[PDB]
């Protein structure tokens, strides 16, 4: 994931229903400690018998069949951004939520004291903001961190609103220890769906919470 | 079933208003429309499901929220007179076409510069014209509510304690009679023989939805809260 060029970023002013991104990062994520699959639809996904305000079943599509059957029986911890429209879990029964990735083994991945990760925000080429992110997982998913980053920026800097955004472009760059860095565009294509957008989390990319960095790049309208 | 709350609302310009829609049909799609005298029913915002909303045809000035399958809210951050209207909510299954939709009871929303114009109604009952009360064979009572504002009222007829819809002839809609004054009327027809029976009881029930607790009214004058006034009368 080699850095993005200005022309490579999505413009927020070009999104008709950007508030459907807002909802995702403005509200609570779906989190579950030590649970194990219960069912499955496609070969690359796992279904859990967990509940939340709007669901009694959770489906998580993973990277591939391999990763799916890899976590199939293990006791995982779940942390993701769920969506409801177009969330086919079965044929009939509903009240199910869907996400991508957000899975990690629960046993021996927790920390005594939460690990704080510094998030260095740069607005208009000027890194003028820094705030902390916290996690208690040794190996955390980029998704978990990405969410925490956006939940903060939305609440404090109005990254997203139920409508337009004050920023035109934006992205988060993950800088792992001895591995290639990568990033996620904060905005979607002019026409999108939560499900199609959230595929950035499907590869279930995990990071060493102790040796990973986070940089955020924003430009105002 | 589809419900809306509030069903009546008077707001001050520049204030925040929140109309709420609750459904029990478990339909994925929910809608928010507005209706304007003479004009049509227009779509403001709608939703394909929880956690998402979509811009309708006249989204400007409105925000929407779909906290869950059952609830769909319409938020008006900065209320303005142009937003005075009758709002309708609706849930929809399948593709969400009209034949697949179910509407709420509607919500009257009136936005004013200040609430000092809001006034309850004057209700009066009238006995049948001496003329018709001979070579008419039918006695017709008239109930008139007027001097009220805004137009958030209901008029119902009750004879002998039980409600009646037969013979009743209420006006389709409150006719405005002045800038800050509405007027509504209704007739109740019965047989002279019935109207002349001292045992029969006629009652015109009128309800006017007025300011609520949430609404702040300048102390000193009586807060024009909701009223349930009734003009009654006996036979002969």
From Swiss-Prot, chain A:
Cellular-component GO terms for this entry: extracellular region
Keyword terms: Disulfide bond, Signal, Toxin, Virulence
Family matches, as InterPro entries: Enterotoxin, Staph/Strept_toxin_CS, Staph_tox_OB, SuperAg_toxin_C, Superantigen_bac, Toxin_b-grasp_Staph/Strep
UniProt cross-references to Gene3D superfamilies, sorted A to Z: 2.40.50.110, 3.10.20.120
GO molecular function, one term: toxin activity
Annotated S-S bridges: 87-98
Keyword set includes Disulfide bond: yes
The keyword Transport belongs to this UniProt entry's keyword annotation: no
Family: Belongs to the staphylococcal/streptococcal toxin family.
Described function: Causative agent of the symptoms associated with scarlet fever, have been associated with streptococcal toxic shock-like disease and may play a role in the early events of rheumatic fever.
Further remarks about this protein from its record: Binds to major histocompatibility complex class II beta chain.
Protein known as: Exotoxin type A
Organism: Streptococcus pyogenes
Swiss-Prot record, chain B:
Keyword Repressor: no
Coiled-coil parts of chain: none
Membrane topology: Single-pass membrane protein
Domain of life per record: Eukaryota
Keywords annotated in UniProt: Glycoprotein, Immunoglobulin domain, Membrane, Receptor, Transmembrane, Transmembrane helix
Record flagged with keyword Transmembrane helix: yes
A single Gene Ontology CC term: alpha-beta T cell receptor complex
Glycosylation sites: 179, 228
UniProt-annotated location(s): Membrane
Spans annotated as C region: 113-236
More details: Clone B10.A was isolated from a cytotoxic T lymphocyte.
Protein name: T-cell receptor beta-2 chain C region
Organism encoding this protein: Mus musculus
Lineage, top ranks: Eukaryota, Metazoa, Chordata, Craniata, Vertebrata
């Amino acid at each position: 994931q080699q850095d993005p060029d200005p022309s490579q970023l999505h413009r927020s002013s070009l999104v008709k229903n950007l508030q459907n991104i807002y909802f995702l990062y403005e509200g609570d994520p779906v989190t579950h400690e030590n649970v194990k699959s219960v069912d499955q639809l496609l070969s690359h996904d796992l279904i859990y018998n967990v509940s939340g305000p709007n669901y009694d079943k959770l489906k998580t599509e993973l990277k591939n069949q391999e990763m799916a059957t890899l976590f199939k029986d293990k006791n995982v911890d779940i942390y993701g951004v769920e969506y409801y429209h177009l969330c086919y879990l079965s044929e009939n029964a509903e009240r199910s939520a869907c996400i991508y990735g957000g899975v990690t083994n629960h046993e021996g991945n927790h920390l005594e004291i939460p690990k704080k990760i510094v998030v260095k925000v740069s607005i208009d080429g000027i890194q003028s903001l820094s705030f902390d992110i916290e996690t208690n997982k040794k190996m955390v998913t980029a998704q978990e961190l990405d969410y925490k980053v956006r939940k903060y920026l939305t609440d404090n800097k109005q990254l997203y609103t139920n409508g337009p955004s004050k920023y035109e472009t934006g992205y988060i760059k993950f800088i792992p220890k001895n591995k290639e860095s990568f990033w996620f565009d904060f905005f979607p294509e002019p026409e999108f769906t939560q499900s199609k957008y959230l595929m950035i989390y499907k590869d279930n990319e995990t990071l060493d919470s102790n040796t990973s960095q986070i940089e955020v790049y924003l430009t105002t309208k | 079933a589809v419900t809306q709350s509030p069903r009546n609302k008077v707001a001050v310009t520049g204030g925040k208003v929140t109309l709420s829609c609750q459904q029990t049909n478990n339909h994925n799609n929910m809608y928010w429309y507005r209706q304007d005298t003479g004009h049509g029913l227009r779509l403001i915002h709608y939703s394909y499901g929880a956690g998402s909303t979509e811009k309708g045809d006249i989204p400007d000035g409105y925000k929407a929220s779909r906290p869950s399958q059952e609830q769909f809210s319409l938020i008006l951050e900065l209320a303005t007179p142009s937003q005075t209207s009758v709002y309708f909510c609706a849930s929809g299954g399948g593709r969400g076409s009209y034949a697949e939709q179910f509407f709420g009871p509607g919500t009257r929303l009136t936005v004013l510069e200040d609430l000092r114009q809001v006034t309850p109604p004057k209700v009066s009952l009238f006995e049948p014209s001496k003329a018709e009360i001979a070579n008419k064979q039918k006695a017709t009572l008239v109930c008139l509510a007027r001097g009220f504002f805004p137009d958030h009222v209901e008029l119902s007829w009750w004879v002998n304690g039980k409600e009646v819809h037969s013979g009743v002839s209420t006006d389709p809609q409150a006719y405005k009679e002045s800038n800050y004054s509405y007027c509504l009327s209704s007739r109740l027809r019965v047989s002279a023989t019935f109207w002349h029976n001292p045992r029969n009881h006629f009652r015109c029930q009128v309800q006017f939805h007025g300011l609520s607790e949430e609404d702040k009214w300048p102390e000193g004058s009586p807060k024009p809260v909701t009223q349930n006034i009734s003009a009654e009368a006996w036979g002969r």
